[PDB]
Design a protein around this ligand. Sequence first.
Ligand SMILES: *[C@@H]1O[C@H](CO)[C@@H](O[C@@H]2O[C@H](CO)[C@@H](O[C@@H]3O[C@H](CO)[C@@H](O)[C@H](O[C@H]4O[C@H](CO[C@H]5O[C@H](CO)[C@@H](O)[C@H](O)[C@@H]5O)[C@@H](O)[C@H](O)[C@@H]4O[C@H]4O[C@H](CO)[C@@H](O)[C@H](O)[C@@H]4O[C@H]4O[C@H](CO)[C@@H](O)[C@H](O)[C@@H]4O)[C@@H]3O)[C@H](O)[C@H]2NC(C)=O)[C@H](O)[C@H]1NC(C)=O
Ligand SMILES: [Ca+2]
Ligand code: NA
Ligand SMILES: [Zn+2]
Length: 388
Amino acid sequence: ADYKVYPWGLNDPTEGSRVMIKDPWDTVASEFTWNSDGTKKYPTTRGNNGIAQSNPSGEDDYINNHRPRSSNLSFNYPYSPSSSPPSSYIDASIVQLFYTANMYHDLLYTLGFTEKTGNFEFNNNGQGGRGNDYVILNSQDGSGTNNANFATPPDGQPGRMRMYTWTKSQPYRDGSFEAGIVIHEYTHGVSNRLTGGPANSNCLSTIEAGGMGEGWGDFMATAIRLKAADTRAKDYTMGAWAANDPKGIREYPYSTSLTTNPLAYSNVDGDDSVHSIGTVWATMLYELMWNLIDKHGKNVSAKPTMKGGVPTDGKYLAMKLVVDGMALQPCNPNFVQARDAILDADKALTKGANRCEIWKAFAKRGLGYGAKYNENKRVTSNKLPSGC
Ligand SMILES: *[C@@H]1O[C@H](CO)[C@@H](O[C@@H]2O[C@H](CO)[C@@H](O[C@@H]3O[C@H](CO)[C@@H](O)[C@H](O[C@H]4O[C@H](CO[C@H]5O[C@H](CO)[C@@H](O)[C@H](O)[C@@H]5O)[C@@H](O)[C@H](O)[C@@H]4O[C@H]4O[C@H](CO)[C@@H](O)[C@H](O)[C@@H]4O[C@H]4O[C@H](CO)[C@@H](O)[C@H](O)[C@@H]4O)[C@@H]3O)[C@H](O)[C@H]2NC(C)=O)[C@H](O)[C@H]1NC(C)=O
Ligand SMILES: [Ca+2]
Ligand code: NA
Ligand SMILES: [Zn+2]
């Protein structure tokens, strides 16, 4: 199979060019490839991890909606961001959406989000959990604009991603080519499944937990787009291309500068917006990630190197600790509990080798030793525990 796409790690069409990629699946994470479910091989954007199509009506049917058919699985369709209208490149759009979602399935699998932990696949090949729950991936979905969304039922019923067209530019911009938005939405599936176990999908339903829900997706999007030349001085926005706005869609850029991004845990007080709260959480995670990269180095290839189940580089280690924390934290967690789950994930993974790097990141932004959740007036702390 060949996919003509912006490769994994390019956040949007401004960061690079499309190329032909052969057989881009991980054979271990996608043992039937992306284009089979173990029963049928599909000459289109359908297989064990997802089914992608256009959805002009914006309704709920998907099985018979349009998707490009190629009997030799050569998915090479035209696209330029200068093209208009979006319907003219729906085939390229569907293929990009399918590619990004399946690449993310494979990375997440490597990080431990597998059939038995509640992932999204049609045929689980007897590896535990409930199947029949690949992701339904709708491109150019007619139910809205200037956004995207993800619906996560309990394990065994499909996730559903709706990608919209953005109308803040002429020509319109198709959100399926902003990998960061795809990754953000898919991460809602990950966090809702892992939190409180795969049978409970209502475990991020409070305002603070819903806030982390938004932040985890912004974080994973930001981690995936990091480039080899980046240092912690790099700032990253969210959705800047699709929204046609250099500030992106959050209040401040993700930055390790407390001037560029002054957010702290106290900024959650009185905040009624999960996207705002999620900006605080993702900013804390950006801090954590760079502490770990500065300590361990960066891997900016599409697969971590794992020694004894531990990523050797800091970027993948950060992603691993964040995903592990999701499975350890209580249902409807607060930031303190989520922090503690990441610390506990590191205890389990490395015997606490990264304790101080984790505490420093969180303490920098008011979630240090002695911080306490309160619905209305949180207790902040910049303190570190003994030894850090
Ligand atoms: C999966 O499936 C899809 C199919 O759905 C595949 O995609 C299709 O890919 C092909 C390319 O292989 C596309 O065809 C190209 O279409 C464009 C227009 O859109 C044409 O310019 C191009 O025309 C050239 O090739 C054809 C066919 O060549 C085959 O058969 C010949 C004998 O019949 C054979 O000799 C040749 O080597 C091929 O096996 C040919 O008939 C044309 O004359 C033309 O070839 C000449 O020109 C090219 C330069 O463009 C030269 O490289 C080539 O050698 C020829 O050169 C001679 O003639 C020149 C004068 O014309 C002269 O200057 C030279 O000196 C020389 O004498 C193709 O028709 C097709 O459109 C794609 N898809 C679609 C939507 O149709 C995909 O590849 C496949 N993938 C996999 C992994 O299997
Ligand atoms: Ca499942
Ligand atoms: Na599987
Ligand atoms: Zn979201």
